[PDB]
Amino acid sequence: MNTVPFTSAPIEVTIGIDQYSFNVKENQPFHGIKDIPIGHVHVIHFQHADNSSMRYGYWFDCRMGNFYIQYDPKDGLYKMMEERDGAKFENIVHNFKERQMMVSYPKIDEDDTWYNLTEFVQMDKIRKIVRKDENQFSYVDSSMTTVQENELSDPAHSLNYTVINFKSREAIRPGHEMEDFLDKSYYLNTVMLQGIFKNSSNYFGELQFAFLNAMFFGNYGSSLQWHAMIELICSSATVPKHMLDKLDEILYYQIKTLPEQYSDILLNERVWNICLYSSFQKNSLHNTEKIMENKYPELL
Amino acid sequence: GAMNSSNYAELFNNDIKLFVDDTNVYRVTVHKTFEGNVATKAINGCIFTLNPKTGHLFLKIIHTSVWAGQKRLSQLAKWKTAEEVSALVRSLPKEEQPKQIIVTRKAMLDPLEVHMLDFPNIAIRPTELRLPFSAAMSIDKLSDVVMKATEPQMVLFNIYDDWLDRISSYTAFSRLTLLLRALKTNEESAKMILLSDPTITIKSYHLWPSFTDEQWITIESQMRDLILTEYGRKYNV
Numbered sequence: 437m438n439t440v441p442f443t444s445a446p447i448e449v450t451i452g453i454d455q456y457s458f459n460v461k462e463n464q465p466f467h468g469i470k471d472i473p474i475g476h477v478h479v480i481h482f483q484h485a486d487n488s489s490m491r492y493g494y495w496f497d498c499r500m501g502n503f504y505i506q507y508d509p510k511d512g513l514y515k516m517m518e519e520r521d522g523a524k525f526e527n528i529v530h531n532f533k534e535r536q537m538m539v540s541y542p543k544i545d546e547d548d549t550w551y552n553l554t555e556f557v558q559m560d561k562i563r564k565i566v567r568k569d570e571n572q573f574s575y576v577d578s579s580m581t582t583v584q585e586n587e588l589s590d591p592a593h594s595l596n597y598t599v600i601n602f603k604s605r606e607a608i609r610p611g612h613e614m615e616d617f618l619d620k621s622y623y624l625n626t627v628m629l630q631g632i633f634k635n636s637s638n639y640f641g642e643l644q645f646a647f648l649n650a651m652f653f654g655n656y657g658s659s660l661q662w663h664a665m666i667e668l669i670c671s672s673a674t675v676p677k678h679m680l681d682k683l684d685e686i687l688y689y690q691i692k693t694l695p696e697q698y699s700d701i702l703l704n705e706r707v708w709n710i711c712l713y714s715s716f717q718k719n720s721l722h723n724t725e726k727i728m729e730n731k732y733p734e735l736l
Numbered sequence: 737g738a739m740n741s742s743n744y745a746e747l748f749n750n751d752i753k754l755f756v757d758d759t760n761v762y763r764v765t766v767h768k769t770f771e772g773n774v775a776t777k778a779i780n781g782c783i784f785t786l787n788p789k790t791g792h793l794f795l796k797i798i799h800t801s802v803w804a805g806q807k808r809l810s811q812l813a814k815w816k817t818a819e820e821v822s823a824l825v826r827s828l829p830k831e832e833q834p835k836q837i838i839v840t841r842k843a844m845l846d847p848l849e850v851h852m853l854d855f856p857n858i859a860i861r862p863t864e865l866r867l868p869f870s871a872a873m874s875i876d877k878l879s880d881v882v883m884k885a886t887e888p889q890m891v892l893f894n895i896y897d898d899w900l901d902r903i904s905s906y907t908a909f910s911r912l913t914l915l916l917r918a919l920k921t922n923e924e925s926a927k928m929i930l931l932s933d934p935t936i937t938i939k940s941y942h943l944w945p946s947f948t949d950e951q952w953i954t955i956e957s958q959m960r961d962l963i964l965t966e967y968g969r970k971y972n973v
């Protein structure tokens with residue numbers, strides 16, 4: 437189990453850690469989060485009490501370094517930093533733990549939610565979508581645009597998701613215009629899987645990361661990417677059986693975790709109705725269709 | 737974006753543009769089978785691609801052999817239309833290629849956009865106008881070449897005959913749409929109006945009769961009366 441200490445908490449803020457959150461008062465004696473499960477990526481996220489504008493946060497993996505949070509009064513945000521002095525870090529954590537100034541990552545033993553949401557998400561792949569090579573952790577916020585959003589404006593602050601565009605030469609073979617537009621299997625299997633992602637695990641990792649950024653930061657471009665990657669599979673007549681079964685599991689846990697009151701903004705009616713009721717895969721997503729129909733029957 | 741009554745003079749500016757109408761591409765007769773089921777029999781169709789400024793009509797005849805062994809023909813017809821329009825554009829010299837293609841039915845937008853990805857600077861647009869181009873097969877010389885075709889064939893026509901020697905393209909398009917709307921509303925009466933007088937003939941190289949300017953005014957009035965007459969018959973007015 438690993439720890440992310442905080443130097444202090446000078447401004448009132450709601451702090452998230454993965455799917456959990458808690459409120460810290462201004463100048464409250466909060467000094468971090470302990471008992472963070474090793475083996476997964478994590479996200480630690482912030483929404484200031486006095487300005488809910490800009491949710492922001494950091495994706496990290498405690499296996500890659502010792503990380504802590506410290507507020508910067510000039511830039512006005514909680515910043516993640518890496519501590520390279522291993523003995524200093526251990527001594528800091530131990531004192532804060534002895535004084536009981538940390539919250540414990542509140543994982544229920546039966547609960548696989550976080551694993552199920554991050555099964556295919558790897559830090560190395562996050563760091564290629566979010567480009568800032570001098571840090572081992574990656575900053576994301578509510579306002580960051582995607583490479584695709586920018587083509588239709590600062591490049592260094594962009595989410596470099598893989599561009600998916602159904603009416604593009606990449607998606608449509610000359611001479612197979614009708615075939616490739618109505619059945620996206622070529623674009624899914626040859627262009628995206630064999631060509632760009634190399635395997636379905638990397639494709640699912642990016643889909644899962646897009647969902648999590650949409651949910652935790654309200655990042656609109658990430659929501660667009662998440663739906664595009666779902667639509668691309670559902671709109672393909674030829675998908676390996678193992679991918680369809682895994683997609684059903686991925687989406688089931690995403691829909692299960694979504695705040696019920698954020699459905700209006702995080703779910704695209706057209707894509708979901710098309711995917712569940714019209715597409716080639718309308719009958720392949722049994723678990724996802726059941727949870728969607730019981731939890732969000734209005735959207736459908 | 738969409739082409740409507742606000743931007744109507746745009747049709748007659750100097751930017752090359754084409755209307756594409758697909759309403760006569762896939763044509764069938766519905767009939768009973770020996771067992772009392774229902775089947776369709778295709779008949780030859782056509783793509784109606786028209787430059788409204790010059791009267792240039794590229795009539796691509798769609799021979800029934802195109803449909804042999806194919807499924808979902810009403811869907812295929814849209815993609816075949818787009819394939820043929822794309823092939824026409826590529827066949828034209830660069831300085832003759834359109835800058836815009838206006839489709840008369842919104843279901844043609846995605847098929848044509850996809851076929852024209854190689855031409856990102858040609859705008860593909862819908863229209864809010866209700867144009868009567870389906871009635872093109874009521875023009876006898878057009879129907880004749882479509883029905884006689886034994887293989888795929890492109891036939892070229894100036895749909896305005898020689899009218900542009902005497903009138904503007906705005907007025908020629910208005911005359912064309914009035915004639916086609918009349919033929920669509922009551923084909924028999926419209927043809928009677930156009931051919932009732934044996935002394936006015938259709939030149940070998942023309943589609944419509946050789947009316948003088950004053951005769952065209954009479955004809956145009958008779959077509960408006962027909963359209964209004966049929967409107968009253970339809971709605972009991």
Ligand SMILES: O=S(=O)(c1cccs1)N1CCOCC1
Pocket residue numbers: 791792793794892893894
């Ligand atoms: O010039 S045209 O009016 C023309 C129409 C379409 C493309 S070029 N013309 C060419 C000869 O055949 C008769 C019609």
